[PDB]
């Protein structure tokens, strides 16, 4: 069953999708988002349709070295993590502090103690890629802040 907050998130996402057609998305795609969230929760135990499932349905309907998805997965995690201390007002994060946070968001996905150093080494390399793309602005700690873009 759809949760109450899921209704607001769903109408927001449907507005976002309908904005882009100024094919073309109809309310059938809204029902399709509901139905895809139903199916994803059907592939789980919980009947509460959290906004996360609607996010996956939105991404799947909207989408019509290191591997692309693995690197991009690091992006949203670190982008929103830094935006947290912007609202919190806490101390800003160095590269090491960000990397320590990231691995603990995927402790269970880790398989071997050897992979403990492999993904850690990959995280710093991703930081260079992100800074090179200018999504983080380096200031001086070696402070990483959301780049002015």
């Amino acid at each position: 069953i759809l949760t109450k907050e899921a209704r607001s998130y769903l109408v927001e996402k449907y507005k976002e999708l309908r904005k882009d057609d100024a094919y073309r998305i109809t309310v059938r795609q809204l029902e399709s988002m509901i139905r895809l969230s139903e199916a994803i929760a059907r592939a789980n135990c919980v009947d509460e349709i959290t906004p996360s499932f609607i996010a996956e349905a939105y991404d799947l309907l909207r989408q019509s070295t290191v591997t692309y998805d693995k690197y991009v997965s690091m992006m949203n995690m670190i982008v929103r993590k830094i935006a947290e201390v912007d609202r919190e007002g806490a101390e800003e994060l160095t590269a090491v502090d960000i990397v320590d946070w990231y691995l603990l968001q995927k402790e269970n996905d880790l398989g071997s103690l050897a992979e403990y150093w492999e993904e850690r080494r990959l995280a710093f390399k991703v930081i260079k890629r992100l800074v090179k793309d200018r999504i983080l602005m380096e200031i001086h700690k070696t402070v990483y802040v959301i780049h002015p873009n």
Binding site: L110, G111, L113
Partner: peptide, 25 residues
Amino acid sequence: MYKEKMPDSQANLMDRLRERERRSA
């Protein structure tokens, strides 16, 4: 959600994956 906020473990995180690895067999 963002539940894993502060699991500030020591160097035991290497020992953490030994449990993942050595017992999986």
